[PDB]
Write a protein that binds this ligand. Structure first.
Ligand SMILES: [Zn+2]
Length: 116
């Protein structure tokens, strides 16, 4: 019996969850979670590109993540180099709880979960 942690940890399972999110027309939430998981495990030399891609694909070219304005300053301050990339790790925890509480319960009754 798979749980949400098992879904995200297996790449096959996670691709099926992402397909579900595209059917819910909200694949930017899993994509942003996937981007910060890359940044968390990446070589130090790809970090600059990865951070700029996170702030452009999300927060600029798309506007689907829910931070509003309080933490948005922290993002800009991490892009310039004052603060660190820990702001993205906290936003990833908030997006994880969102996927877990309001999208995973719908996912476990779809065939993208039940046939795994
Ligand atoms: Zn990499």
């Amino acid at each position: 019996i798979l749980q949400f942690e098992d879904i995200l940890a297996n790449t096959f399972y996670r691709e099926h969850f992402g397909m579900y999110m595209e059917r819910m027309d909200k694949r930017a939430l899993i994509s942003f979670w996937e981007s910060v998981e890359h940044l968390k495990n990446a070589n130090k030399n790809e970090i600059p590109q990865l951070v700029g891609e996170i702030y452009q694909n999300f927060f600029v070219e798309s506007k689907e993540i829910s931070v509003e304005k309080s933490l948005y300053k922290e993002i800009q301050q991490a892009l310039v180099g004052n603060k660190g990339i820990e702001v993205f790790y906290k936003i990833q925890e908030d997006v994880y709880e969102t996927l877990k509480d309001r999208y995973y319960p719908s996912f476990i009754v779809s065939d993208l979960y039940e046939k795994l």
